[PDB]
């Protein structure tokens, strides 16, 4: 199906502690593949997936060089925003940047993104047309006007439709064994009496990839959304994901309930029953 590449950058000022913290991470779909941490010893972009480890020194030196230039822009940006919002030097502030691209089944360009947040809220974002900006407040208009004058959107559009898509394709090819894989969920149900009158039925999905999944409960074929406890999809730590959905069943009504599992790895959606 579709694929994406995303880079996530976090910049946190540290009053009276010197340099701001800077962390960068890169993902292809739901698989992390690179990292940079200003606090680590290496001061280099590093691999976090086996299929990129052997990319070679020209690749690693290049990613290291560019990510250090990102770090320097963010160090200055923190001071610029402190000024735009007339903030004191005493407080810690966070800048976040995310950019990347989506490709379709045929792997050609579908969408590009480039967006920033200051202290957890939208600051500026490149619009879908990759030609215009959305400035979230008064301060952000100064950036919008500056970026409009310096033709920043044209430069970002070139990267998003070019390098981004080109390298996403390369990584999908190099990491085929694990990026182009689909691991269907291993599923099971558990039953525990809260009390003799009631029991919890919990429907599990384990060891799946990609993360996208739908887990629902029905009672006599009717959706039980309001009465389902559904946990956020969570990483197992080995590159797979987990999720569960639970309902409280009055004792003796187990047969009325069905759990429904939908995932890209399943040829047909699953219907599970406690029986």
């Amino acid at each position: 199906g579709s694929h994406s590449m995303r880079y996530f950058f976090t910049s946190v000022s540290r009053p009276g502690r010197g340099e701001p913290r800077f962390i960068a991470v890169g993902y292809v779909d739901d698989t992390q593949f690179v990292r940079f941490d200003s606090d680590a010893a290496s001061q280099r972009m590093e691999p976090r997936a086996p299929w990129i480890e052997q990319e070679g020194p020209e690749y690693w030196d290049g990613e290291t060089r560019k990510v250090k230039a990102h770090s320097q822009t963010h160090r200055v940006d923190l001071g610029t925003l402190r000024g735009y919002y007339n903030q004191s030097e005493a407080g810690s502030h966070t800048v976040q940047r995310m950019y990347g691209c989506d490709v379709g089944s045929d792997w050609r360009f579908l969408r590009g993104y480039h967006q920033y947040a200051y202290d957890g809220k939208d600051y500026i974002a490149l619009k879908e047309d990759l030609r215009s900006w959305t400035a979230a407040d008064m301060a952000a208009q100064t950036t919008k006007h500056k970026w409009e004058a310096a033709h920043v959107a044209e430069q970002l559009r070139a990267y998003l439709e070019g390098t981004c898509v080109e390298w996403l394709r390369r990584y999908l090819e190099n990491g085929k064994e694990t990026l182009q894989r689909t691991d269907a969920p291993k599923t099971h149900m558990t039953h525990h009496a809260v009390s003799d009158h009631e029991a919890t039925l919990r429907c599990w999905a384990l060891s799946f990839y990609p993360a996208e999944i739908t887990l629902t409960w029905q009672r006599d074929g009717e959706d039980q959304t309001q009465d389902t406890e559904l946990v956020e999809t969570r990483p197992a730590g080995d590159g797979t994901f987990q999720k569960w959905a639970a309902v409280v069943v009055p004792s003796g009504q187990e047969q009325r309930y069905t759990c429904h599992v939908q995932h890209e790895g399943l040829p047909k959606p699953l219907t599970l029953r406690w029986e």
Partner: peptide, 9 residues
């Protein structure tokens, strides 16, 4: 690969 040019806020 990350972007080559980064512009200031």
């Amino acid at each position: 690969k990350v972007a080559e040019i980064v512009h200031f806020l």
